[PDB]
Amino acid sequence: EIVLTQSPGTFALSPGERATLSCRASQSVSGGALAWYQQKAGQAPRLLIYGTSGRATGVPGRFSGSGSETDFSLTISRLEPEDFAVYYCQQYGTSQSTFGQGTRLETRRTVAAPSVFIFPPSDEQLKSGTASVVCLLNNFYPREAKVQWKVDNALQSGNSQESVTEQDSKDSTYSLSSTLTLSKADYEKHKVYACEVTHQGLSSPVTKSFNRGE
Amino acid sequence: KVQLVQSGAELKKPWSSVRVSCKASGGSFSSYAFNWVRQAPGQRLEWLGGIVPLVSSTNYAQRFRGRVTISADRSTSTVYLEMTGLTSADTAVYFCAREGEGWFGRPLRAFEFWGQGTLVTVSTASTKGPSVFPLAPSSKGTAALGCLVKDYFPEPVTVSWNSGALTSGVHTFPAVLQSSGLYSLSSVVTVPSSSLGTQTYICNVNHKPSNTKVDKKVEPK
């Protein structure tokens, strides 16, 4: 089996710049049988390059494919706003064909601090025997952020799940939602519930807290 | 224009079977290779197999040999995928991709035309509608509110705000798979703090697998 490995993992560039994505194969790829696809969130892949260097029908001219043997490259000469997506390489061997893990091209912007909000579990939820405390980190950049839950000033571990949105197509920011799940008994047990956020755009960690039943 | 329209999303129990279709429209059907590529949530593309309908020439990947059968109905210009021995590892979106047309229709190996994708979910969890809880705005600029869509199965749910009239500043987060077999997501929106008293904010949740339409009115604490 041929294993395709793409580099880098995530690229941060600005429109109008040149982007070079590399795809290396575990062994020699047959006579220039390399493909490059573009994929945006929620959609199917779009064929960009066929056969190492062939430009697909309708694909703009700024996309070019090059390489041979075990090293291939997709080059976008002048980045445009609609070019920021995930890019996959594919090897079309014989009786087998594989893909790379993909490279994500994100729009680069000024560092933005997250707007932190905290939501206690609603009474309608507490009437069902469970409690979900929510911490919202709205519109920040870059993607890396750290959320820590504290119940009566005690760091939690395992009882929290988070999710991050795609990069916003307008302001090029991200947003994170962290949910801490507790039993109704464990929620009525303590008093203080806080979420502490650490991000590049913050000189000091931002703690958003609330007291139970106020 | 060549169009590929796939079958609807499916939810199968482990160790059962799934059958996904792919109807082709527009260009020629019998003389090109239709393939099936699946993409697990947050993972890479994976080629399962393909077929050329003219000679019924099938070609499968070694990872799915004996598990995957790909056929074609030339009279209806439809390509079928049938997979057996399903497990939770097979939960993914299944695409049907046809190879490209080159000079004078020269086949291009590379997948130029794609279908919309079919979500196949393999799990023992039963279909359950979501509970919609209000994320009420703080008593304190800009105020953030939202709805928590918890304990539903399977994907997907659709969340709109004020029946679609409110779109700016909305963030519907990707759902996460809980410790149980159920999903949960949150949909928030930032609005002016002054409008909290004169503007009604309603979150519209639709979970069609359970025929569940829920409109939840979010109000301050």
Author numbering:
A (entry chain L): 1 to 27, 27A, 28 to 213
B (entry chain H): 1 to 52, 52A, 53 to 82, 82A, 82B, 82C, 83 to 100, 100A, ...
Task: Please give the exact wording used by the authors of the publication that reports this structure.
MPER bnAbs show outstanding breadth, neutralizing up to >98% primary isolates, but have uncommon features. Notably, long heavy complementarity-determining region (CDR) H3 loops with aromatic residues at the tip facilitate bnAb binding to the hydrophobic MPER and nearby membrane. DNA sequencing revealed PGZL1 was from subclass IgG1, whereas most MPER bnAbs are IgG3s. Using X-ray crystallography and cryo-EM, we determined the orientation, angle of approach, and composition of the PGZL1-Env interaction.
To elucidate potential membrane interactions of PGZL1, we solved crystal structures of PGZL1-MPER671-683 and unliganded H4K3 in the presence of a short acyl tail phosphatidic acid (06:0 PA) at 3.42 Å and 3.11 Å resolution, respectively. We observed lipid-binding sites in both antibody structures. Next to this site in H4K3, a second PA lipid interacts with D72, R73, and S74 in the HC framework region FRH3. To determine whether the lipid-binding sites observed in our structures are biologically relevant, we mutated the H4K3 lipid-binding sites. Both CDRH1 and FRH3 regions form plateau-like structures with main-chain nitrogens making contacts with the lipid head groups. Hence, mutation of the lipid-binding sites influences binding to membrane-embedded Env on the virus but not binding to MPER out of the membrane context. The lipid head groups of the membrane outer leaflet were placed in a plane that roughly includes K683 of gp41 as well as the two lipid head groups and anion sites observed in our crystal structures. Our model suggests that H4K3 contacts the membrane-MPER epitope in a similar manner to 4E106 with the MPER helix tilted 67°–73° from the bilayer surface.
